[PDB]
C-alpha cells in the first residue's frame, strides 16, 4: 500500500494510482464520484451530494461517460474518434479526476479545473487530449476534470417546472468546484487559488460560472479558449428551450410539465439521442439542441446584459481563438464541402453556406454578410469563397463574441489576456485548407508533444512546454509572463484603448492590435441594428 | 480687310469672324473668342431649348471672351485665390451662349482631331472662359483644335416643371448639344477634322459627356469620351421629375409666383430679374447637403429616356472609347462649404460627434440605419475617436459617395457592356495650390495640369511639373487621336491598360512613372453599390 496513493476526503477513502509520464510519477485519482448517480427520477434534476462510503474506493480508472451523441461522419478517422466517448456511456456519469505530483505537494497547490467542450451536447474528461499528467508532472500543478451531463440529460428544460429546472449540467459543474473547496487540500491543492479553464462549450461554461454569483466563491481565475456565455449558441430563451423540449417529447411520443417529463423519465437513453438534432428551427452549423437556458436563476438575465452591466473587478481572465475556428463546422452540413478534398466552392454555394452558417439571418443580413465577407478584387475565386464561408462561421461564432467579451471584461475591471493560436500541428490529420481548426490548441496546453510516441516535432515540444507555463503562471499568479525572464516581449494586458494580444506560434510572442476590429464592429454593433429593422 | 492679319479671317455658316494670334510660351496659336452659336436666351425665351444663332452681317470680333452664364457667385472666402480662380471672369447675362475655339497658328494643313470642353461646377456655375480652361497649350503644344461652350446653368439651365412646353427641363445640356453640331457644322473651316471629336469635362461637365453618351441624338456627335471626377449616374447629377417640380413651385413661391397652370406660373418667372432667381437658388434643397445642386439634369424620358443608372446597366457600348478618373482627395473642397468643424485656415481636426453631424450631411438622403452604416464601415475601430482619422473619414464619405463609387460602377458597367475604358487616379497636390494641406489633391486640381498651365513660366510650378503637364497632354491627345492614351512608339515608357471587369486595373498619375494598380476602391464601393441601394430599398 503506498500512502501517496491513499487519500480520505469528506465522503471517505480512496486509493489513487501512480502513473509514468516522461519526466516522472503522478498519482492520479480517476473516477471520484461528488454526486448521486442522476438516474432513474434523478433525470433532468439537479444532482445531489454523494452520500459517504465505506472501505477504501477505487479511483484507479475513468469512469462512464455521460450518455451522449456519437459522430459518425468520418468512422474510425483519429481527427473525429479523439473526439468521441473512450469509455462506456452511462447516466451514471456525475464523476470527476484529480492529478498531482507524486509524492503529493508539499505546500498547497494552486489548482487548474478543467471544464470539457463538445456544444452542451457531448464530451468526457477522459480523453486523452485532457490527460493533467503532464502538467502535473512538468509544472507541479494540482489539476482536476469533471464530467457533467450533456444533451438532454444536461439541459432539457421546461423553464418554471420543478421536474426540469435547466440548466443542470452547469449545477453538476458548480457542485464539482464545491467538491474541490472541501476535499481538494487533501491532495495538495490550495482552495484559496482555483483557476477554471475549458474550451468551446467548456469555455461558456466558464463564463456563465463567471456571471453566476453563487459560483463566484469557488474560483479566483478564469481562462475562456474558443468559447463564450455570450454569443449565437451558448444560451435559449426561455421560451425556445420550452418549444424544443416540447417538440422532442412529441418525437419520442410523450404523451402539466410534471406528466410531459414523467413519460421522459420513462425512455431510454438512446431513444432522446435520436431526435436530439430534430429539434433545431433551423438547417445550421454550429448550433446545438440543449444548451444552458436563461432561466432567470442561474443566468439572472441574457448573458448579454450582464457583461454589459456586471462589475469584473479582482477578477483575471485570460481569453483567445485559435486561426481557423470555423473550418471544422463546414463539413458537417454545408454543401462543398469535406475533408477529403481541397473544398472549392462557387459563389451559389458560398451564398448558401451563409444561410446555415448565420441561421438567424434576414435575407437582407445575409445578403450584408456576403458582401462583406466578398473579396470584390476576386468575388468568384473559389480559394477565397472557401476560406470565407470559414471566416463567416468562425468570426460569427467565436472570434467576435470573444472580442465582445474581452472588450466589456476590461473596460467594467477585470484582468484580461488575449491570444491568437496559430500553430498548426505537424501530427494534424484534418486537410490543409482547414488551417488550424477548432479544437487543436488543446493537446499543447495539456503537454501532449511530451509524449515521444505521439511523434510531434522538437520545436512543438518546446512550443508546448511554454504553452504550460504561460497557462500556469496565470493560475499562480493572474499575470501568463514567467516572473523569471526578463525579455521583451511581454504579453501585455487586453485593453479597450490599445486592444492589445498576442500570437502563439513557434516563433517569439508577437504583439498585435484590434481583434479583427473592423469585422467584429459589423457583427457587434451593426448586425444587431439591422435583424431588428 | 486688307491690312489685318490674313490668318485670323474665317467664315463659319452664321458669317465671317475675325480672331487674334495669341502667344502661347513655345509659338502663336490661333483664337476665336465669343462664337455666337445660338439666339440669346433672354426674355420670352427663357427656360426655352435653344434656338440656332441667326446669321450675322460683317465681320463679328471674335478676340475676347463674351458674356458668363448667369450664376450664383461663391462668398465663402472673398480675394481668395483657391476660390476666385472658379468665378465669372466676365460680365454675368442670360446672354451667354457663345463658344470658343483655338487652333495652330498658322491653321493645320490636314484636318486635325477636336477636343470639346465641358466646364463643371454642379450645373449652378462655371465659364468657359476661366483662366484653367485656356486652350492655347494644348493647341500649341499638341496641335490640337480645342472649342470650349457656355452652357446655361442654374435655373435658367435646369429649371423644369416636367411635361411643360415652357419648361421641358435639361435647356443647358440641349446647349451643349446645340454647341456639338455646330461643331460638325463648322469645325472645318479652322482645320479640326469634324469625324474625329472627343468631349472631355470635370464635375458636372464630366456628368454632362455621360448624358451625352447616353442620349441618342448627341451620339452622333462625339466618338470618343473623357469623363474627369464626375458622372451621369450618382446622387448628385440627376433628379426625378417629381422632385424637379417641387423645387420649381416652391422656388416660384419664394420669388412670388402664383393655357392653364404651369404655364402662367413659368410666365411669372421669367417677369423676374435673374438676380432674383440666383438669390433664391439654394433654398430649394430638401434637406441640408454638401455635394448637392438645386437645378440640374431630370429624368425626362427624352434627353434622358431613363435614369442614368438604368441606362448604363441595359446598354449597349461596343466601340465606345472612354477615359475615367478622380483625384486623390474628391471629398475635401466640399466639408468647408457646410459640415461644422472643417475650415480652410485650421486643421479642421473634429470630434466623433461633429463626424456622425456630418455623415448626416454629407449622405442627407440617408436613413438613420444607412446613416449608422456609413459610420460603421468609415471608422477606424482601433481610433474611433482620433480627430485625424475623423476629419479624413469624413472628406472619404463625402468623396466615395458622390465621386470615386459612382465612377467605379460606371467603369464597370461600361467595360462589360462593350466599352473600351481607361481609368486613373491623379495623386499629384500642385506646389502652388492655396488651399491647405489636410485637403490633399482636392476636386478640380488636375485640370490646370490636363490644359497645360505649367507650361507658363509666369506662373511658378515646378520643372519636374512641367514634365509631367506634358506627360498628361500626350495622353489625353493620344486619346482624343486613337483611343489610346498610349503612345505607340514608345514600348519603352510603361503602358496603360484598359480597365477590365475581370482585373478592374487603372493607372496612377503622379510625378513618378505610371504605376499600374488593380481595384478602383473595391471593398467599400461594393458598400456604396452594391448593399447601401438594398438598404434603403426597405
Ligand atoms: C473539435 C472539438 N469539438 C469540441 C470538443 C468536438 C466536435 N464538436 S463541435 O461542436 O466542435 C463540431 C460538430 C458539431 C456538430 C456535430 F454533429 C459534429 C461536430
Ligand atoms: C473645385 C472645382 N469646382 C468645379 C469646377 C468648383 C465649383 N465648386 S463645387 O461645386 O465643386 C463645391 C461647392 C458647392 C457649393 C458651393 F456653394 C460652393 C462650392
Ligand atoms: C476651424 O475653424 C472653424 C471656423 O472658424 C471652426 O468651426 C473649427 O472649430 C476650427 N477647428 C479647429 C481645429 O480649430
Ligand atoms: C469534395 O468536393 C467536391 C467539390 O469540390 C464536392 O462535390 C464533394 O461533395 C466533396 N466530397 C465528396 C467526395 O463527396
Ligand atoms: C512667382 O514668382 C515670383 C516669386 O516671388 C512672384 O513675383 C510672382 O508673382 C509669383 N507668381 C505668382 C503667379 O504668384
Same mark, same amino acid.
Given at each position: ?48 451530494? &454523494? ?9 484507479? #480508472?475513468?469512469?462512464?461517460? %455521460? ?25 451514471? %456519469? ?16 494552486? /489548482? ?16 486523452? /487530449? ?88 469557488? $474560483? ?29 417529447? +412529441? ?11 414523467? %413519460? ?23 448550433? $446545438? ?47 462543398? *464541402? ?11 454555394? *458560398?451564398?448558401?453556406? /451563409? ?32 476560406? @470565407? ?20 471584461? @476590461? ?6 489576456? @488575449? ?5 498548426? @500541428?505537424?501530427?494534424? #490529420? ?56 526578463? &525579455? ?7 485593453? #479597450? ?9 513557434? &516563433?517569439?510572442?508577437?504583439? +498585435? ?21
Amino acid at each position: 500500500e503506498d500512502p501517496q496513493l491513499l487519500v480520505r476526503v469528506r465522503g471517505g477513502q480512496l486509493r489513487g494510482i501512480r502513473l509514468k509520464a516522461p519526466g516522472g510519477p503522478v498519482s492520479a485519482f480517476l473516477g471520484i464520484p461528488f454526486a448521486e448517480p442522476p438516474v432513474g427520477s434523478r433525470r433532468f434534476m439537479p444532482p445531489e451530494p &454523494k452520500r459517504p462510503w465505506s472501505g477504501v474506493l477505487d479511483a484507479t #480508472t475513468f469512469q462512464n461517460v %455521460c450518455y451522449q451523441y456519437v459522430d459518425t461522419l468520418y468512422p474510425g478517422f483519429e481527427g473525429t474518434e479523439m473526439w468521441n466517448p473512450n469509455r462506456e456511456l452511462s447516466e451514471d %456519469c456525475l464523476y470527476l479526476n484529480v492529478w498531482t505530483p507524486y509524492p503529493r505537494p508539499a505546500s498547497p497547490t494552486p /489548482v487548474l479545473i478543467w471544464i470539457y467542450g463538445g456544444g452542451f451536447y457531448s464530451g468526457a474528461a477522459s480523453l486523452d /487530449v485532457y490527460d493533467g499528467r503532464f502538467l502535473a508532472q512538468v509544472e507541479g500543478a494540482v489539476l482536476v476534470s469533471m464530467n457533467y451531463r450533456v444533451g438532454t440529460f444536461g439541459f432539457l428544460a421546461l423553464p418554471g417546472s420543478r421536474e426540469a429546472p435547466g440548466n443542470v449540467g452547469l449545477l453538476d459543474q458548480r457542485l464539482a468546484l464545491q467538491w474541490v473547496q472541501e476535499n481538494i487540500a487533501a491532495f495538495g491543492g490550495d482552495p484559496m487559488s482555483v483557476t477554471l479553464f475549458g474550451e468551446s462549450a467548456g469555455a461558456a461554461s466558464v463564463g456563465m460560472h463567471i456571471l453566476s454569483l453563487p459560483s463566484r466563491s469557488l $474560483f479566483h481565475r478564469a481562462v475562456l479558449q474558443s468559447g463564450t456565455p455570450n454569443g449565437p449558441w451558448a444560451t435559449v430563451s426561455a421560451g425556445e428551450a420550452r418549444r424544443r423540449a416540447t417538440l422532442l417529447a +412529441r418525437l419520442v411520443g410523450c404523451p402539466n410539465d410534471t406528466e410531459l417529463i414523467a %413519460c421522459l423519465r420513462t425512455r431510454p437513453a438512446q431513444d432522446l439521442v435520436d431526435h436530439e438534432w430534430h429539434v433545431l428551427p433551423q438547417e445550421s452549423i454550429f448550433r $446545438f439542441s440543449f444548451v444552458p437556458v436563461v432561466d432567470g436563476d442561474f443566468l439572472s438575465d441574457t448573458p448579454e446584459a450582464l457583461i454589459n452591466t456586471g462589475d469584473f473587478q479582482d477578477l483575471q481572465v485570460l481569453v483567445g481563438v485559435v486561426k481557423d475556428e470555423g473550418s471544422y463546422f463546414l463539413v458537417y452540413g454545408v454543401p462543398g *464541402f469535406s475533408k477529403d478534398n481541397e473544398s472549392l466552392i462557387s459563389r451559389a454555394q *458560398f451564398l448558401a453556406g /451563409v444561410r446555415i452558417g448565420v441561421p438567424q439571418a434576414s435575407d437582407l443580413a445575409a445578403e450584408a454578410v456576403v458582401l462583406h465577407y466578398t473579396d470584390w478584387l476576386h468575388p468568384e475565386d473559389p480559394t477565397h469563397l472557401r476560406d @470565407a464561408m470559414s471566416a463567416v462561421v468562425g468570426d460569427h461564432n467565436v472570434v467576435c463574441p470573444v472580442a465582445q467579451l474581452a472588450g466589456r471584461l @476590461a473596460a467594467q475591471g477585470a484582468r484580461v489576456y @488575449a491570444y491568437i493560436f496559430e500553430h498548426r @500541428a505537424s501530427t494534424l #490529420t484534418w486537410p490543409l485548407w482547414m488551417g488550424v481548426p477548432h479544437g487543436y490548441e488543446i493537446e499543447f496546453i495539456f503537454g501532449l508533444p511530451l509524449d515521444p510516441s505521439l511523434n510531434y516535432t522538437t520545436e512543438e515540444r518546446i512550443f508546448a512546454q511554454r504553452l504550460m507555463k504561460y497557462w500556469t503562471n496565470f493560475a499562480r499568479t493572474g499575470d501568463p509572463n514567467d516572473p523569471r525572464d526578463s &525579455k521583451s516581449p511581454q504579453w501585455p494586458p487586453y485593453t #479597450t484603448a490599445a486592444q492589445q494580444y498576442v500570437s502563439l506560434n513557434l &516563433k517569439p510572442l508577437e504583439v +498585435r492590435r484590434g481583434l479583427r476590429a473592423q469585422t467584429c464592429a459589423f457583427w457587434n454593433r451593426f448586425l444587431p441594428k439591422l435583424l431588428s429593422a
